[PDB]
Amino acid sequence: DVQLVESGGGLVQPGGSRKLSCSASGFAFSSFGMHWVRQAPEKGLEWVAYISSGSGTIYYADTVKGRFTISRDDPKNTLFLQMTSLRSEDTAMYYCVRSIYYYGSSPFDFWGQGTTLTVSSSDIVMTQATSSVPVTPGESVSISCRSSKSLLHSNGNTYLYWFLQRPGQSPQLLIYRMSNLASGVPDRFSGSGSGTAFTLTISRLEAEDVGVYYCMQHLEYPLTFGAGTKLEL
Amino acid sequence: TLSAEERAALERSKAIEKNLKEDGISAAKDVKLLLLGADNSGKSTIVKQMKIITGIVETHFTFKNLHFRLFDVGGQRSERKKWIHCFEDVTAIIFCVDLSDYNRMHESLMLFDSICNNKFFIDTSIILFLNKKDLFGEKIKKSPLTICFPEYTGPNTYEDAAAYIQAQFESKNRSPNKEIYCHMTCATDTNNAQVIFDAVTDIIIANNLRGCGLY
Amino acid sequence: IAQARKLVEQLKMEANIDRIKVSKAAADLMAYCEAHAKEDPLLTPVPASENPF
Amino acid sequence: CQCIKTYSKPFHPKFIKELRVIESGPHCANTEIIVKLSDGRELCLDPKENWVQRVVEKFLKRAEN
Amino acid sequence: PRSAKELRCQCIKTYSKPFHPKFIKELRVIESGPHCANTEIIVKLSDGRELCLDPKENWVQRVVEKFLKRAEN
Amino acid sequence: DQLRQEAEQLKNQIRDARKACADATLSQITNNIDPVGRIQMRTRRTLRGHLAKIYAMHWGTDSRLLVSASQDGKLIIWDSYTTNKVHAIPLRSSWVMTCAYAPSGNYVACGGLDNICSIYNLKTREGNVRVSRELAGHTGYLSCCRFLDDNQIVTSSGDTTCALWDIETGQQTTTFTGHTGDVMSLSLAPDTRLFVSGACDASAKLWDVREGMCRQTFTGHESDINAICFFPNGNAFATGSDDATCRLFDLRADQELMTYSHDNIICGITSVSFSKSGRLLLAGYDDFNCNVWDALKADRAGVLAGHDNRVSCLGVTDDGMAVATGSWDSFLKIWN
Amino acid sequence: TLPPFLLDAAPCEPESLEINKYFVVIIYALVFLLSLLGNSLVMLVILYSRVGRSVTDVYLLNLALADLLFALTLPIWAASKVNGWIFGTFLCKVVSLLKEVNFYSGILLLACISVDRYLAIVHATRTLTQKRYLVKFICLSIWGLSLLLALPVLLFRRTVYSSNVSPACYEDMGNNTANWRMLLRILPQSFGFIVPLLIMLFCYGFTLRTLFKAHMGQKHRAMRVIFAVVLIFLLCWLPYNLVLLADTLMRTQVIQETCERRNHIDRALDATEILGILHSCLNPLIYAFIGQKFRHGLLKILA
């Protein structure tokens, strides 16, 4: 069983330092690239940092560039994130996500359980049209979001990722390039798009399909998420 | 390597190549030898330091900071012409002959003749082992060395008879750049690993001499 | 005696085959290679703009 | 003799590498001066010309260093 | 005129006994350069014998000057 | 003794019937078709990373992914476009003689002298490649594994027999017997219902995967058959032998159509492959170079060359865009 | 008023001969032709087939290039010997640079080949033998070192016009040129004779010691080849360096100086230069064509 668990959250004062650990058990940790994604309260997901397999390539978000640091302990199957100075903006549910990159891979399949951190008191912009969509079961629903640049590379691949965050759970990958269904997701989900406009369709909607849908681009770092579309029933 | 995903794919490929080259480095300190010979000829009990590991059998004993890998091809019971080219790069050939078997001696000679003159093994030196001196020494007194070799004419002593068998095996060489390193072994011999080690080192010099252009 | 019994049985089935003249078979193989000839990037070189290699 | 004609264009002594003087006598009539320059040329100089006399003295003084 | 790959001085040693300039008929002076590290003075004698004088010795300068002065007349 | 006479007369009946069907040779009917000229093919990619002889190679169904096995004990999956290594699978036994790729891209079966067909799973949840199943039951060296589905594979061995396996259970569902020598190659028909196996008895015989019956046998070669491949329409196949000759046999006529022998060729054929159209018959030879034969006129339509050692495997993509060759010099080259 | 007389204080005039000139021209032309043909054949044999390109092949290719360049420069040197340097300062500098660079490269490549053989034989079974697969970088470093050591020739050479002798492509380092030339001679005799000689002697002595102890059937031929290589190197280079050291000692007055000895030293220098020039022709036979591989290649190419 693939399992990512994070610990180290809690209430800390501004200006202090905290360390978050993401221990992995159930997959070859030494071959996966691990990301840090944080979700501010009722605002949405946001990419933070990424370390490549073997600790070769390291990237940080512009918001916390030079302030955070990421380290990798392959023999211990643990991923760390040491934060130097914390403002009131750092409070969020930090997730731990694994990613493997090769021809035809799924680099955002599994998300960690997330830990809650509380602090006391150019880029590709992706926009989602709406924020709440009421619908009844059995009715097809279409979700669409745009982007600044054209995500269609010259290689023919479009780098768009669709995630679903059920209430009280962690985001789950559904479509990882434009229309490639993830592993284990129902076949009713389907995706399309053309360069800068993309659509996600859910035929024969079921009761468990409710939640917040996020569309993300992987064309170029830093990674940017959408506003977030919520399905209501 | 323009896209962000393709940049990591190139990083994965380069990480794979590093382990591929690293494994090749660790695969250059071992000597690959080939075991041949008739059945019940001691081809599985040459060195008492076995450390073995139906089909192909490997043996990976080490000696003097050098790794010796012995491949036993017996038991395949198929046509040798189709899989003997896999061992084209072995350092040497180890041949085991039982001197006490007067009926399989002609069978062993056919095996040696075919292997020595094979097109793939035209340059691989052969380390020939003549086993069971004591058993042969007692056998010759009871039965002279004439039923197996009617052409024998010299004295019936052990020294001439054993050397006569050795001459027949080396008469099948018929090739240059190949040297046959013989040795007489018995059941209670422990220095078989030493004999193999000096022969292998001697074979490497001959190949290195040809590569360096000295010969 | 029990080894070659199946040998003649196999030859019995191999002899009862609805065979076709090689003249018709040769034409059929010629038609296929001529029909699917526009879709062979090896017989006729592909344009450099449509060459993945 | 060893000289026929003499250069009529004064030149700086700095190019004079080797000097040779042959006094008049049974062999010839006028004293001959042969100079080998830095560029390999050989020149014959008339001793009666003032510039030749000054050049010879300058070369002699330089060579004494 | 031959060719050589080593250039050497034309005088090994020098004559040391002062003598009257009346015995000099031909003079040759070679400035120091790549060939030799010292200036060289070579003089023909009355009977045709050649001598090497010391360029730096006191009397040699006097003798050379007197010879050149007399010849220049 | 009486059955021996019955065996002989049955051969005579087949030969007379086979000869009566022959009216005109293949090279006599297509004598008016214009030649294809010179097929000059240039090396587009050079895949390096193997440290030993390359013995097998198979193309992916998407014509982009490759697989190659070598004596070094490594199993490498290549990205044929950008020359990137996707996977590197360490084998248990370094003596691998054949190596196959699944039609769905999920699995890879790749085995050899260890008498075991090892099947590896690529799309695992743990991120690594694991040995899903090891098939055992052959008493001789293995050759020409070929996937039928994700749970069904045909294998060939030196036991003079081929086998049909079930990957899930692991038991030998069907066994095909009839050869009198080591079986060196097999190829699966496009309709995935028949296949032909070339053995060392200088005979290739058509077998049925559903019934396990030797429907027909084909003769004519003077030495052992080393490779085999169907015509693209699944009505004919071409073989390569140590006789330095290639032959084209028709399943419906049960007779060879033409031979691809050249006077300058001495060494035998190692691999046989066809183009997408069924006109260029590519064959690998032991003299380090591959030849392109016009399958209708037996004319050498160019030579690939380039390799330094014996070419041990050939491969043509499903779309026919490129040809991959492997040799004992530890290099894969992609031609177009 | 007494004639001074002459008591050995006379100018030592050099002696010139013309037979030596014609002989030198013939020898230089023969050497040029032989070196050109041999080095071209070696290059063609190595470069025709890219299969089996071993370390020795790379070393022999570099050595062949060096020898070919040396031979290509020889003819202008022969003409200069005939009639002194009339070709100008720029050609003097360029030709001298090329000649000295190729000389240093050849010597250092011989030393590198000796080290390679030492590693290949003495340490055949050890893990140090794996360190000889750096042929490209080692050859590049040797070429760079030769270029560095040949700079003084480029910087301090020009045409010198003397009186007793014809013009010479000599060194002009100032009024004190003799001493600077004597010092600069240290490099050719240290990185050109002593260091390569010691390296070769050590390596080949240990190689022979290991070979004599082995039981191969080819030990004798390899030993004879090693002896031939060492003796060829000595015969080619020892006399010239000995005469050069004798000249250096004579100039420094460690040994007595006289006209007879100066003339003898000049003659010996000429003879030894002629003798040492033969390496460009003898290398292809000694190192390349004494091997079965190259002979078989040459036979195959002519098919």
Question: For every residue of G21-43, which 3-state class applies, written as one string?
Answer: HHHHHHHHHHHHHHHHHHHHHHH
- Cα-trace Rg, chain G: 22
SS3 content of chain C, % helix, strand, coil (to 5): 55, 0, 45
What secondary structure does DSSP assign to B131-197, as a single string? Answer: E-HHHHHHHHHHS-TTSS-TT--S-SSHHHHHHHHHHHHHTT---SS--EEEEE--TT--THHHHHH
- The alpha helices in D1-65, defined as continuous H runs, are 50-63
Cβ neighbors of A166 (< 8 A, separation 6 or more) are A172, A208, A210, A211
CA distances from B102 to A130, B109, B111, B113, B186 (A): 95, 12, 15, 18, 17
Written as one letter, the residue type at G211 is L
Q: Any idea which residue has 């990882």 for tokens?
A: A176
Q: How many CB atoms lie within 10 A of CB F180?
A: 10
B132: left (phi over 0), alpha (psi -120 to 50) or beta: left
Domains of chain C plus CATH, in order, are: 1-53 (4.10.260.10)
Distance CA G147, CA G152 (A): 10
Phi, psi of A8 (to 5 degrees): 125, 0
Interhelix angle G19-48/G292-301, nearest 10 degrees: 80
Q: How many CB atoms lie within 10 A of CB F255?
A: 17
**Chain D closest CA to E19's CA: distance in Å?**
18
Structure tokens at D1: 């003799």
Candidates A57, A102, A153; nearest CB to B9: A102
Distance CA B141, CA F321 (A): 75
**Three-state SS for F158?**
coil
Q: Order across the sheet with F74-79: list the strands.
A: F54-59, F65-70, F74-79, F84-90
**Three-state SS for F211?**
coil
Query: Would the CB atoms of A2 and F126 count as touching at under 8 Å?
Result: yes
CA distances from A102 to A57, B7, F69 (A): 16, 10, 20
Cβ neighbors of F79 (< 8 A, separation 6 or more) are A103, B9, B13, F64, F65, F85, F86
Distance CA A173, CA A184 (A): 10
Distance CA B125, CA B197 (A): 14
Question: Is the four-CA dihedral B162, B163, B167, B170 of positive or negative sign?
Answer: positive
Chains A and E are touching, with contact defined as 3 or more CB–CB pairs separated by less than 8 Å: no
Distance CA A219, CA A101 (A): 13
Q: Are strands G168-171 and E50-53 parallel, antiparallel or unpaired?
A: unpaired
CA distances from G140 to G46, G52, G114 (A): 19, 21, 17
Cα–chain center distance at G224: 23
Distance CA B200, CA B206 (A): 10
Resolution (angstroms) equals: 3.0
Q: Which of F306, F62, F57, F44 is nearest to C46 (CA)?
A: F44
**Half-sphere exposure in the Cβ direction for B82 (13 Å, CA):** 30
Cβ neighbors of F62 (< 8 A, separation 6 or more) are F105, F318
Interhelix angle C5-15/F2-21, nearest 10 degrees: 20
Query: Would the CB atoms of A52 and B8 count as touching at under 8 Å?
Result: yes
DSSP state for residue A158 in the 8-state scheme: B
Cα–chain center distance at F218: 16
Using a CB–CB cutoff of 8 Å, tell me whether G252 touches chain E.
no
Using a CB–CB cutoff of 8 Å, tell me whether D40 touches chain E.
no
Distance CA F183, CA G281 (A): 58
Cβ-contact G97, G154 below 8 angstroms: yes
Distance CA B67, CA B87 (A): 17
Mutate which of F126, F128, F129 to disrupt the A interface (most A C-beta within 10 Å)? F126
CA distances from G223 to B205, B214, B215, G207, G227 (A): 13, 8, 9, 9, 6
Question: Is the four-CA dihedral G163, G168, G173, G176 of positive or negative sign?
Answer: negative
DSSP state for residue F49 in the 8-state scheme: -
Q: Which fold has domain F1-335?
A: Methylamine Dehydrogenase; Chain H (2.130.10)
Tell me which chain F residue has its CA closest to the CA of residue A99: F127
Written as one letter, the residue type at F1 is D
- The alpha helices in chain E, defined as continuous H runs, are 58-72
Q: Is B189 exposed, middle or buried (0-12, 13-18, 19+ CB in 10 A)?
A: middle
Triad B191, B192, B196: Cα angle to 5°: 120
Triad C45, C46, C50: Cα angle to 5°: 160
Query: Would the CB atoms of F82 and B6 count as touching at under 8 Å?
Result: yes
- Cis bond leading into A222, ω under 30°? yes
Residues of chain E in contact with residue G257, where contact means CB-CB under 8 angstroms, are 12
Question: Is the four-CA dihedral G281, G282, G288, G292 of positive or negative sign?
Answer: positive
Triad F30, F243, F322: Cα angle to 5°: 60
Distance CA F292, CA F280 (A): 6
Cβ-contact F221, F241 below 8 angstroms: yes
Distance CA F269, CA F287 (A): 9
DSSP state for residue A166 in the 8-state scheme: -
Cβ-contact E40, E34 below 8 angstroms: no
Residues of chain A in contact with residue B12, where contact means CB-CB under 8 angstroms, are 53, 101-102
Q: Which of B15, A1, B11, A79 is nearest to F126 (CA)?
A: A1
Tell me which chain G residue has its CA closest to the CA of residue E30: G163
Structure tokens at F281: 């018959």
Enumerate the β-bridge partners of residue D56.
none
Q: Which of F43, F8, F54, F92 is nearest to F335 (CA)?
A: F43
Residues of chain A in contact with residue F90, where contact means CB-CB under 8 angstroms, are none
Distance CA E46, CA F167 (A): 121
Mutate which of D18, D21, D39 to disrupt the E interface (most E C-beta within 10 Å)? D21
Buried b (16+ CB within 10 A) or exposed e, G175-198: eebbebbeeeeeebeebbbeebbe
Distance CA G107, CA G111 (A): 6
What secondary structure does DSSP assign to F120-142, as a single string? Answer: EESS-TTSS-EEEEEE---SS-E
Buried b (16+ CB within 10 A) or exposed e, A207-216: eebbbbbbbb
Distance CA G76, CA G59 (A): 28
Distance CA A200, CA A133 (A): 13
Domains of chain A plus CATH, in order, are: 3-119 (2.60.40.10), 126-231 (2.60.40.10)
Residues of chain A in contact with residue F64, where contact means CB-CB under 8 angstroms, are 103
Cβ neighbors of A48 (< 8 A, separation 6 or more) are A35, A36, A37, A38, A60, A61, A64, A68, A81, A94
Q: Are strands F172-177 and B180-184 parallel, antiparallel or unpaired?
A: unpaired
Distance CA F129, CA C19 (A): 48
Q: Residue ranges per domain, chain F?
A: 1-335
- Cα-trace Rg, chain B: 22
Distance CA G116, CA F121 (A): 47
Q: Any idea which residue has 């079965």 for tokens?
A: G292
Query: Would the CB atoms of B20 and F74 count as touching at under 8 Å?
Result: yes
Strands of A74-114, DSSP E: 78-83, 92-99
SS (H, E, C) G162-184: CCCECCEEEECCCCCHHHHHHHH
- Cα-trace Rg, chain F: 20
D to E CB pairs, distance under 8 Å: 49
Q: How many CB atoms lie within 10 A of CB G49?
A: 12
Element (H, E) at F199: strand F194-199
Query: Would the CB atoms of A2 and F64 count as touching at under 8 Å?
Result: no
Cβ-contact F250, C22 below 8 angstroms: yes
Distance CA A50, CA A58 (A): 6
Distance CA F205, CA F187 (A): 11
Distance CA E31, CA E40 (A): 7
CA distances from G194 to C42, G269, G282 (A): 63, 19, 21
G241: left (phi over 0), alpha (psi -120 to 50) or beta: alpha
Cβ neighbors of B27 (< 8 A, separation 6 or more) are F51, F72
Enumerate the β-bridge partners of residue B181.
B127
Residues of chain E in contact with residue D50, where contact means CB-CB under 8 angstroms, are none
Structure tokens at B119: 């097109």
Mutate which of G20, G22, G25, G177 to disrupt the E interface (most E C-beta within 10 Å)? G177
What secondary structure does DSSP assign to B81-137, as a single string? Answer: GGTGGGGTT-SEEEEEEETT-SSSHHHHHHHHHHHHT-STTSS--EEEEEE-HHHHH
Cα–chain center distance at B12: 41
Q: Is B143 exposed, middle or buried (0-12, 13-18, 19+ CB in 10 A)?
A: exposed
Candidates D21, D62, D63; nearest CB to E68: D21
Q: How many CB atoms lie within 10 A of CB B21?
A: 11
